[PDB]
Amino acid sequence: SRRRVVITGMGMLSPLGLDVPSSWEGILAGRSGIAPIEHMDLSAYSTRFGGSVKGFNVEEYLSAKEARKLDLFIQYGLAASFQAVRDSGLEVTDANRERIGVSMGSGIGGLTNIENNCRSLFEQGPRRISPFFVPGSIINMVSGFLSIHLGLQGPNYALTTAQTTGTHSIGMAARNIAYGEADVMVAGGSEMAACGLGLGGFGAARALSTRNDEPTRASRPWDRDRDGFVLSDGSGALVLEELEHARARGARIYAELVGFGMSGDAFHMTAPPEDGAGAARCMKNALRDAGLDPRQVDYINAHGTSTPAGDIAEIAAVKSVFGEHAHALSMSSTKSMTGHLLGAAGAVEAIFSVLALRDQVAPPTINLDNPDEGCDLDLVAHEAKPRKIDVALSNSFGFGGTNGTLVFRRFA
Amino acid sequence: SRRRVVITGMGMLSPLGLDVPSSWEGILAGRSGIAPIEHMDLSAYSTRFGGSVKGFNVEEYLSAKEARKLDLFIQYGLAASFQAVRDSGLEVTDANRERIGVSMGSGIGGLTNIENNCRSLFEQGPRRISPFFVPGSIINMVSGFLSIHLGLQGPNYALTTAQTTGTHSIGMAARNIAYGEADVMVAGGSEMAACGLGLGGFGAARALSTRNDEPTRASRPWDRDRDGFVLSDGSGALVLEELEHARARGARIYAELVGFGMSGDAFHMTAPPEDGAGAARCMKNALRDAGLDPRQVDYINAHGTSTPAGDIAEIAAVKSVFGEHAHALSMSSTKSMTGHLLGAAGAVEAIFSVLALRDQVAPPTINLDNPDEGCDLDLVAHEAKPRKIDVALSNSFGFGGTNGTLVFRRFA
Ligand SMILES: CC(C)c1ncc(Cl)c(C(N)=O)n1
Ligand SMILES: CC(C)c1ncc(Cl)c(C(N)=O)n1
Ligand SMILES: CC(C)c1ncc(Cl)c(C(N)=O)n1
């Protein structure tokens, strides 16, 4: 029968820091991680800024021999995973290695490496493709390399559900533990899509903010002057652990994962329905999964991408699920500060939701100068709001109409 | 407890055929779908052959306009999925659409689209990248597009576990149903990596057979003259359905899905351990999941890729798990005929495992002219073997040491 799941360790790379505490300090101070991109020339592009990871030292985590063969998204995923496992205090042994698995996902994976090898192929021929091209680029190799480095022999897989990846990865890893398939899972996501194909492709879809002259103001969820999402890089990883297994080893427990919901919009390849019907179905699934009255929800980490249709669909979904209580909870988009980490969005946002619980503070939605029509909830405009938070919900919505909701609560 | 899961519908594109019965007819006749790749200059490449889908007509499924937006791997996944749903007879309604979901995966995703958009970007700059590049290339768009087309509102996700994708997708979809998160799932995988990037990428790792003179003899699992796997394209989709749901509407049931096993080798990025210890844990996990003794297994659809180390690891793993029964079961690699469909391998091989049960016949391992050292199991060399099959296993063992096993049983 279904076991309880707690969070015992967290790890992160974000545009705000090279770990969780540094990222969280940035979140609570309303700091932007968005800046013009330096790692390539973007003068031909309609968007030239993003949330880059600043000063990432892979030689804190991996031999340079290994690092040189792995896409940045794998390096970022391993870094966050290593942080999370160290943070957990968990020791891997012959007695437990079969019971510890990994589910680290990505939306796109090793686009930079694939682009770079495509350029080699076209200009120079196939003999110039890297021998490490496949294992260094495909999405499942965060899970793969983490298992090899730590000796994890439990379920080993990867999700790819676009902007919902991190939320799905964490939810389905919790189900693995709940149902007895594992006692521990390392789960989350990683993304580094900031190459010509990534910025060019989202640019071709007119999905990105073009606020090149004021990048820190570009990401403005629910603001009347929003003009698309900001592309950001990084990773989130959590150690999920069965409750009794955590208790038995004296683990520090951050929070309990009580609820997971999924749904499909079955509406449009890229656009959310205006009424947020699929998002509402997904949150209701999650609240019923957690055995909660919707009034128990104190804080929502919104998807809040700063798109015209996405931001308003989320207000419509929260109002439909929570009714009058929609005016009592706090909802914020930390994408106002971090931008959109795509496959890693749900992973860093789950961590922010757990830290909202630990610290009893709703993070701000920065740049919310002029809330749009009907965006009249507590969106924690501009400044962090200390408040009672027993239950936190993290939402993600993705291309394909794919929705995920995670429900966390304080653990006593 | 747990609900029972049955197979009510199947769909396929393979190198042997454009549907299940044509593909299966090729399998039982020992036909090869391997040939030199056409409409492509592979002069500078060390491998110039593989398993192409021949004569695929996407306009049987999609309008020309909707097909132009989607990578070939997505088109192939949608063709298999539509076939599977049609085969099942299922009627989607407002009363059941929240209980019907999708988990169709891919190993490598939209390399063809990535190539063609790289060409545009490198030659003409980012403003010539297709607007549909991102939503038409990402792995979760088979699940996305299928959900939108059929109005499926159930769990909507995509796995990417390299060569294990199709096996994991089907197994985790079976869990969704068993644990009451869905009544119906469409599950499996699709792949189209016979672009330069796939032939070039696997070729740079020297993972491919280079038997260009005789492509049909290239894929020769357990034969002493094997020299790596053969790259192939296509898709497999199953309709998985809760047993009472299937009985209530009078569904034709092909077989029961009784077991799902996962493990991680935690050994190496691309090569299995010599003794196949991970593959052995995974098969034991699958049989435990099914409450079956190894003695009850009649038929194994091997991973059987035609790599020197992979093939010998699987023999060791089967001898370890099955002991005095390892010679009584029959084990074959249909990759001897189809080549290696990577993420779709596990999907088409689950369908071949179900059909082995329906028709009481072990498909052949063609090209097994000279079994290697210690490859003395019943490998069904050369020709199909009619026999008793109550229980059939399908194994997938991929990059990152990620393992999956499905256990199917006759239903009556
Ligand atoms: C199994 C037989 C009846 C068959 N032949 C061809 C096709 Cl394409 C299909 C299908 N499921 O769409 N089914
Ligand atoms: C499985 C059933 C519904 C089906 N689907 C597709 C085809 Cl092609 C046929 C047929 N050949 O009459 N029958
Ligand atoms: C990229 C190469 C050097 C590499 N890096 C890390 C690992 Cl863990 C392995 C492996 N054991 O398969 N190989």
Short mmCIF file of N, CA, C and O in Angstrom, two decimals, chain A residues 305-383:
data_model
loop_
_atom_site.label_atom_id
_atom_site.label_comp_id
_atom_site.label_asym_id
_atom_site.label_seq_id
_atom_site.Cartn_x
_atom_site.Cartn_y
_atom_site.Cartn_z
N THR A 305 4.98 32.17 -17.10
CA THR A 305 6.11 32.26 -18.08
C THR A 305 6.28 33.69 -18.62
O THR A 305 7.29 33.91 -19.30
N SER A 306 5.31 34.60 -18.41
CA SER A 306 5.33 35.97 -19.01
C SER A 306 4.91 35.91 -20.49
O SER A 306 5.27 36.81 -21.29
N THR A 307 4.04 34.97 -20.84
CA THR A 307 3.37 34.98 -22.16
C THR A 307 1.98 35.58 -21.94
O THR A 307 1.36 35.40 -20.89
N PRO A 308 1.47 36.31 -22.95
CA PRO A 308 0.10 36.83 -22.92
C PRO A 308 -0.92 35.74 -22.56
O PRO A 308 -1.59 35.91 -21.60
N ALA A 309 -0.97 34.61 -23.27
CA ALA A 309 -2.05 33.62 -23.08
C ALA A 309 -1.75 32.73 -21.86
O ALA A 309 -2.69 32.39 -21.14
N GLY A 310 -0.50 32.33 -21.64
CA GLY A 310 -0.19 31.43 -20.52
C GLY A 310 -0.55 32.03 -19.16
O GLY A 310 -1.16 31.33 -18.36
N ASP A 311 -0.15 33.28 -18.91
CA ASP A 311 -0.29 33.95 -17.60
C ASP A 311 -1.78 34.08 -17.28
O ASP A 311 -2.19 33.76 -16.17
N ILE A 312 -2.58 34.48 -18.25
CA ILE A 312 -4.03 34.70 -18.01
C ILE A 312 -4.74 33.34 -17.82
O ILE A 312 -5.61 33.26 -16.96
N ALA A 313 -4.37 32.29 -18.56
CA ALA A 313 -4.96 30.93 -18.43
C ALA A 313 -4.76 30.43 -16.98
O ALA A 313 -5.66 29.74 -16.45
N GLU A 314 -3.59 30.72 -16.39
CA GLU A 314 -3.26 30.28 -15.01
C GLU A 314 -4.14 31.01 -14.01
O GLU A 314 -4.61 30.34 -13.09
N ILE A 315 -4.38 32.31 -14.19
CA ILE A 315 -5.32 33.03 -13.28
C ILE A 315 -6.69 32.35 -13.37
O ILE A 315 -7.29 32.09 -12.33
N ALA A 316 -7.15 32.07 -14.59
CA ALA A 316 -8.49 31.49 -14.83
C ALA A 316 -8.54 30.13 -14.12
O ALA A 316 -9.53 29.87 -13.45
N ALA A 317 -7.46 29.33 -14.18
CA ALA A 317 -7.42 27.97 -13.59
C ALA A 317 -7.45 28.08 -12.07
O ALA A 317 -8.20 27.31 -11.46
N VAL A 318 -6.63 28.96 -11.50
CA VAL A 318 -6.57 29.13 -10.02
C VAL A 318 -7.95 29.60 -9.51
O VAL A 318 -8.42 29.04 -8.51
N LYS A 319 -8.57 30.58 -10.16
CA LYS A 319 -9.94 31.06 -9.78
C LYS A 319 -10.94 29.92 -9.88
O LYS A 319 -11.78 29.80 -8.99
N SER A 320 -10.86 29.07 -10.89
CA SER A 320 -11.84 27.98 -11.08
C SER A 320 -11.66 26.92 -9.98
O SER A 320 -12.69 26.45 -9.43
N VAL A 321 -10.42 26.61 -9.56
CA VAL A 321 -10.10 25.53 -8.59
C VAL A 321 -10.38 26.04 -7.17
O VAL A 321 -10.88 25.27 -6.35
N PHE A 322 -10.01 27.27 -6.88
CA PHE A 322 -9.97 27.76 -5.49
C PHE A 322 -11.16 28.67 -5.16
O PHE A 322 -11.32 28.94 -3.99
N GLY A 323 -11.95 29.11 -6.14
CA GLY A 323 -13.10 30.00 -5.88
C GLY A 323 -12.69 31.20 -5.04
O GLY A 323 -11.68 31.80 -5.35
N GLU A 324 -13.44 31.53 -3.97
CA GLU A 324 -13.17 32.70 -3.10
C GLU A 324 -11.80 32.57 -2.42
O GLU A 324 -11.14 33.60 -2.21
N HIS A 325 -11.33 31.35 -2.17
CA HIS A 325 -10.00 31.14 -1.53
C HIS A 325 -8.89 31.61 -2.48
O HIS A 325 -7.76 31.87 -1.99
N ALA A 326 -9.16 31.78 -3.78
CA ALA A 326 -8.16 32.29 -4.73
C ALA A 326 -7.62 33.66 -4.26
O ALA A 326 -6.43 33.97 -4.59
N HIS A 327 -8.44 34.42 -3.52
CA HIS A 327 -8.10 35.76 -2.97
C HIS A 327 -7.33 35.67 -1.64
O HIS A 327 -6.82 36.70 -1.22
N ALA A 328 -7.17 34.49 -1.03
CA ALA A 328 -6.52 34.35 0.30
C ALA A 328 -5.11 33.74 0.15
O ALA A 328 -4.21 34.17 0.88
N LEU A 329 -4.92 32.81 -0.78
CA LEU A 329 -3.59 32.22 -1.03
C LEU A 329 -2.70 33.30 -1.67
O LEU A 329 -3.22 34.34 -2.12
N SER A 330 -1.40 33.06 -1.70
CA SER A 330 -0.40 33.87 -2.46
C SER A 330 0.10 33.06 -3.64
O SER A 330 0.43 31.87 -3.45
N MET A 331 0.17 33.68 -4.80
CA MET A 331 0.71 33.03 -6.02
C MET A 331 1.79 33.93 -6.58
O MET A 331 1.55 35.11 -6.73
N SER A 332 2.96 33.39 -6.88
CA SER A 332 4.04 34.18 -7.49
C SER A 332 4.74 33.37 -8.57
O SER A 332 4.71 32.10 -8.51
N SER A 333 5.33 34.09 -9.52
CA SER A 333 6.18 33.46 -10.55
C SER A 333 7.63 33.85 -10.25
O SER A 333 8.01 35.04 -10.42
N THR A 334 8.44 32.89 -9.85
CA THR A 334 9.89 33.12 -9.66
C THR A 334 10.57 33.23 -11.03
O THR A 334 11.75 33.61 -11.05
N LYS A 335 9.87 32.90 -12.13
CA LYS A 335 10.36 33.16 -13.51
C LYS A 335 10.50 34.67 -13.78
O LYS A 335 11.23 35.02 -14.74
N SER A 336 9.88 35.51 -12.97
CA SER A 336 10.10 36.98 -13.01
C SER A 336 11.59 37.28 -12.82
O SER A 336 12.07 38.26 -13.43
N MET A 337 12.29 36.47 -12.02
CA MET A 337 13.72 36.63 -11.63
C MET A 337 14.65 35.65 -12.36
O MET A 337 15.77 36.05 -12.78
N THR A 338 14.24 34.38 -12.53
CA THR A 338 15.11 33.32 -13.08
C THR A 338 14.95 33.17 -14.58
O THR A 338 15.81 32.51 -15.17
N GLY A 339 13.84 33.68 -15.14
CA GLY A 339 13.41 33.30 -16.49
C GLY A 339 12.98 31.85 -16.49
O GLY A 339 12.82 31.29 -15.41
N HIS A 340 12.74 31.32 -17.68
CA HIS A 340 12.12 30.01 -17.94
C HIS A 340 13.21 28.99 -18.22
O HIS A 340 13.81 29.04 -19.31
N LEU A 341 13.46 28.10 -17.25
CA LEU A 341 14.50 27.04 -17.36
C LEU A 341 13.94 25.82 -18.09
O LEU A 341 14.66 24.79 -18.19
N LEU A 342 12.75 25.93 -18.67
CA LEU A 342 12.19 24.93 -19.61
C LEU A 342 12.11 23.61 -18.83
O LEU A 342 11.42 23.58 -17.80
N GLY A 343 12.78 22.55 -19.28
CA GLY A 343 12.74 21.23 -18.58
C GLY A 343 13.16 21.30 -17.12
O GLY A 343 12.72 20.42 -16.33
N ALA A 344 14.01 22.27 -16.73
CA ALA A 344 14.49 22.43 -15.35
C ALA A 344 13.57 23.36 -14.55
O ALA A 344 13.73 23.41 -13.34
N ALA A 345 12.62 24.07 -15.19
CA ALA A 345 11.70 25.02 -14.51
C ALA A 345 10.99 24.35 -13.33
O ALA A 345 11.05 24.92 -12.23
N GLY A 346 10.41 23.18 -13.54
CA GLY A 346 9.62 22.51 -12.49
C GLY A 346 10.54 22.05 -11.38
O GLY A 346 10.10 21.96 -10.23
N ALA A 347 11.80 21.76 -11.67
CA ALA A 347 12.73 21.25 -10.64
C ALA A 347 13.18 22.41 -9.73
O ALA A 347 13.06 22.28 -8.51
N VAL A 348 13.63 23.53 -10.28
CA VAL A 348 14.08 24.67 -9.43
C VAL A 348 12.87 25.24 -8.69
O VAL A 348 13.00 25.62 -7.53
N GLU A 349 11.70 25.26 -9.34
CA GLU A 349 10.47 25.80 -8.74
C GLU A 349 9.94 24.87 -7.64
O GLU A 349 9.38 25.39 -6.71
N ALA A 350 10.10 23.55 -7.76
CA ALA A 350 9.77 22.65 -6.63
C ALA A 350 10.66 23.01 -5.43
O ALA A 350 10.15 23.07 -4.28
N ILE A 351 11.95 23.24 -5.66
CA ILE A 351 12.90 23.58 -4.57
C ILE A 351 12.45 24.90 -3.94
O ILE A 351 12.40 24.98 -2.71
N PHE A 352 12.07 25.90 -4.74
CA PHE A 352 11.65 27.22 -4.21
C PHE A 352 10.39 27.02 -3.38
O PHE A 352 10.22 27.69 -2.38
N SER A 353 9.50 26.11 -3.81
CA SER A 353 8.23 25.79 -3.09
C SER A 353 8.54 25.17 -1.73
O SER A 353 7.88 25.48 -0.74
N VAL A 354 9.53 24.28 -1.68
CA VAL A 354 9.96 23.64 -0.40
C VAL A 354 10.59 24.71 0.50
O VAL A 354 10.30 24.73 1.71
N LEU A 355 11.38 25.61 -0.06
CA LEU A 355 12.03 26.67 0.74
C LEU A 355 11.00 27.70 1.18
O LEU A 355 11.17 28.23 2.29
N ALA A 356 9.94 27.96 0.39
CA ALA A 356 8.79 28.78 0.83
C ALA A 356 8.22 28.17 2.12
O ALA A 356 7.92 28.92 3.09
N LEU A 357 8.12 26.83 2.17
CA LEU A 357 7.62 26.12 3.36
C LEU A 357 8.63 26.28 4.51
O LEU A 357 8.18 26.60 5.63
N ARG A 358 9.91 26.01 4.29
CA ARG A 358 10.93 26.06 5.37
C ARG A 358 10.93 27.46 5.99
O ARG A 358 10.97 27.56 7.22
N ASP A 359 10.91 28.51 5.17
CA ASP A 359 11.19 29.91 5.61
C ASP A 359 9.91 30.70 5.86
O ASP A 359 10.00 31.81 6.37
N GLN A 360 8.74 30.16 5.52
CA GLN A 360 7.43 30.84 5.70
C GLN A 360 7.46 32.19 5.00
O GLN A 360 7.10 33.24 5.62
N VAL A 361 7.79 32.17 3.71
CA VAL A 361 7.84 33.39 2.87
C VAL A 361 7.42 33.03 1.45
O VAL A 361 7.91 32.01 0.93
N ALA A 362 6.51 33.82 0.89
CA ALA A 362 6.16 33.81 -0.54
C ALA A 362 7.18 34.65 -1.28
O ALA A 362 7.29 35.86 -1.04
N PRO A 363 7.93 34.06 -2.23
CA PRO A 363 8.79 34.84 -3.13
C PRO A 363 8.00 35.83 -3.97
O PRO A 363 6.83 35.60 -4.25
N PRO A 364 8.62 36.95 -4.38
CA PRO A 364 7.94 37.95 -5.20
C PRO A 364 7.81 37.53 -6.67
O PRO A 364 8.58 36.72 -7.14
N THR A 365 6.82 38.09 -7.33
CA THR A 365 6.80 38.25 -8.81
C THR A 365 7.37 39.64 -9.08
O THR A 365 6.63 40.60 -8.86
N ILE A 366 8.65 39.78 -9.39
CA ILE A 366 9.19 41.12 -9.73
C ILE A 366 8.63 41.57 -11.09
O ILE A 366 8.06 40.73 -11.88
N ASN A 367 8.72 42.87 -11.34
CA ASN A 367 8.32 43.52 -12.61
C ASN A 367 6.81 43.59 -12.80
O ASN A 367 6.39 44.01 -13.91
N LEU A 368 6.02 43.27 -11.79
CA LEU A 368 4.53 43.31 -11.87
C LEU A 368 4.07 44.75 -11.59
O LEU A 368 3.46 44.98 -10.55
N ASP A 369 4.34 45.65 -12.53
CA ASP A 369 4.13 47.11 -12.36
C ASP A 369 2.64 47.39 -12.59
O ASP A 369 2.07 48.17 -11.80
N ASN A 370 2.05 46.78 -13.62
CA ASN A 370 0.64 47.02 -14.02
C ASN A 370 -0.03 45.67 -14.31
O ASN A 370 -0.08 45.20 -15.46
N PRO A 371 -0.62 45.04 -13.26
CA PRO A 371 -1.29 43.76 -13.43
C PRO A 371 -2.32 43.90 -14.55
O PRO A 371 -3.02 44.91 -14.61
N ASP A 372 -2.36 42.91 -15.43
CA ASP A 372 -3.27 42.92 -16.59
C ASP A 372 -4.72 42.72 -16.13
O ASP A 372 -4.96 42.48 -14.94
N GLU A 373 -5.66 42.82 -17.07
CA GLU A 373 -7.11 42.59 -16.84
C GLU A 373 -7.30 41.22 -16.17
O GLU A 373 -6.76 40.20 -16.68
N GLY A 374 -8.01 41.23 -15.04
CA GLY A 374 -8.39 40.03 -14.26
C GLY A 374 -7.25 39.42 -13.45
O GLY A 374 -7.52 38.40 -12.82
N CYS A 375 -6.03 39.97 -13.48
CA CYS A 375 -4.85 39.46 -12.73
C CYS A 375 -4.86 40.14 -11.35
O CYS A 375 -3.91 40.87 -11.02
N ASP A 376 -5.93 39.90 -10.58
CA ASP A 376 -6.27 40.69 -9.37
C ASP A 376 -6.17 39.80 -8.13
O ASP A 376 -6.84 40.09 -7.14
N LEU A 377 -5.37 38.73 -8.20
CA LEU A 377 -5.05 37.90 -7.02
C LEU A 377 -3.88 38.53 -6.26
O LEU A 377 -3.23 39.52 -6.74
N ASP A 378 -3.55 37.96 -5.10
CA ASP A 378 -2.25 38.24 -4.46
C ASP A 378 -1.14 37.55 -5.28
O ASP A 378 -0.88 36.34 -5.07
N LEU A 379 -0.53 38.30 -6.19
CA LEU A 379 0.61 37.85 -7.02
C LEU A 379 1.96 38.22 -6.40
O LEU A 379 2.98 38.02 -7.03
N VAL A 380 1.99 38.62 -5.13
CA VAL A 380 3.23 38.96 -4.38
C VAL A 380 4.07 39.93 -5.21
O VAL A 380 5.27 39.70 -5.39
N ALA A 381 3.46 40.97 -5.74
CA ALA A 381 4.12 41.96 -6.61
C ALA A 381 5.37 42.54 -5.90
O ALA A 381 5.28 42.93 -4.70
N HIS A 382 6.50 42.59 -6.62
CA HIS A 382 7.73 43.36 -6.28
C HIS A 382 8.54 42.76 -5.12
O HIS A 382 9.75 42.73 -5.24
N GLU A 383 7.91 42.41 -3.99
CA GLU A 383 8.64 42.12 -2.73
C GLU A 383 8.13 40.85 -2.07
O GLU A 383 6.89 40.65 -2.02
#
